[PDB]
Amino acid sequence: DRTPLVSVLLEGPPHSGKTALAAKIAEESNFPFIKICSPDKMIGFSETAKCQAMKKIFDDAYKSQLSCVVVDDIERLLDYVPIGPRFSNLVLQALLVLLKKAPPQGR
Amino acid sequence: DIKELAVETKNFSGAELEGLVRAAQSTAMNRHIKASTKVEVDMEKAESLQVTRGDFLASLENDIKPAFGTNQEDYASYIMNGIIKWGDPVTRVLDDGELLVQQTKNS
Numbered sequence: 050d051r052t053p054l055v056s057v058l059l060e061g062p063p064h065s066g067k068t069a070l071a072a073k074i075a076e077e078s079n080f081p082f083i084k085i086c087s088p089d090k091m092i093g094f095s096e097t098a099k100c101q102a103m104k105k106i107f108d109d110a111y112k113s114q115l116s117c118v119v120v121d122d123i124e125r126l127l128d129y130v131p132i133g134p135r136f137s138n139l140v141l142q143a144l145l146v147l148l149k150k151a152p153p154q155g156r
Numbered sequence: 157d158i159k160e161l162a163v164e165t166k167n168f169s170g171a172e173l174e175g176l177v178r179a180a181q182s183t184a185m186n187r188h189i190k191a192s193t194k195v196e197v198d199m200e201k202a203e204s205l206q207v208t209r210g211d212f213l214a215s216l217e218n219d220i221k222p223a224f225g226t227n228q229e230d231y232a233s234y235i236m237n238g239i240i241k242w243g244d245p246v247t248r249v250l251d252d253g254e255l256l257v258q259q260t261k262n263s
């Protein structure tokens with residue numbers, strides 16, 4: 050009741066099969082509302098479009114009594130590459146702000 | 157008591173002050189109407205209508221909400237678990253805040 054918002058990070062080396070485990074846990078949660086945000090459906094988008102899409106997906110989850118959401122392959126979401134390095138700042142700020150916004154009271 | 161309401165209704169305009177009274181009045185009249193299979197005014201107690209403080213408080217907390225400034229809905233979110241005096245520094249911080257606000261008011 051004190052903590053209406055919790056989060057966790059799964060990590061490991063490549064080809065260890067982690068996204069599958071996250072999907073399994075989410076499916077076993079038995080929550081009414083389950084959605085998966087993946088880069089596979091944002092090919093070629095400009096960063097603004099990514100921000101808006103994530104905002105919409107999250108907003109849809111504030112209208113239920115119980116929700117679970119999965120963020121997949123964060124590094125691909127930021128457009129990261131070792132050289133430089135080079136990344137998108139706007140999306141990173143969006144995420145950082147969006148991991149501590151509590152939902153409407155009672156959810 | 158009028159003074160309590162006058163003090164508590166902050167940022168209200170004239171129209172909202174009228175609306176509060178209207179909503180408060182509606183409550184008793186509703187208390188006397190039984191609408192389950194056919195709207196039927198009682199008339200056996202309609203000669204005893206009274207308006208009590210609880211009606212005003214409920215109407216304040218549920219129906220009317222101003223459209224200016226900061227209200228309870230914000231302080232509720234930002235201060236989620238209140239303040240607990242676990243040591244000395246809390247009092248010191250609050251005292252410094254008091255000094256600063258007083259200086260701003262007077263100087």
Ligand SMILES: Nc1ncnc2c1ncn2[C@@H]1O[C@H](COP(=O)(O)OP(=O)(O)OP(=O)(O)O)[C@@H](O)[C@H]1O
Nearest residue numbers: 061062063064065066067068069070071072121122
């Ligand atoms: N015990 C298991 N744990 C996880 N995945 C398993 C297991 N047994 C079989 N699999 C299968 O292995 C595959 C794991 O691939 P997955 O996409 O989850 O890996 P990934 O870590 O996301 O990949 P990458 O890191 O390259 O992006 C899936 O087909 C999954 O169903």
